[PDB]
Amino acid sequence: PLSSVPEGTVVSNVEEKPGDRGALGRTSGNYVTVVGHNPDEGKTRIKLPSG
């Protein structure tokens, strides 16, 4: 899960909502980057390939 991840790591096939089995960053040579966390009201900022 994206919470158990430090900032700055690249991942792939990220779920828009928990349980939909992959929506984002699933093309050859692409990825997404985590930016920061909000431990309260848990939500994470990410950066998409388009910017």
Answer yes or no whether residue 42 interacts with other proteins by CB under 8 A: no
Out of 4, 28, 38, 50, name the contact with other proteins by CB under 8 A: 28
51 binds, among Mg ion, other proteins, none (CB under 5 to 8 A by kind): none
Please give the DSSP secondary-structure letter assigned to residue 43.
Answer: E
Rounded CA separation 10/30 (Å): 9
CB closer to other proteins out of 4 and 50: 4
- Give the x/- contact pattern for Mg ion in 11-50, rule: CB under 5 A: ------------x---------------------------
* Contact between 32 and 3 (Cβ < 8 Å): no
Question: Residue 41: which residues within 8 A CB-CB, separation 6 or more?
Answer: none
Residue for token digits 């994206």? 2
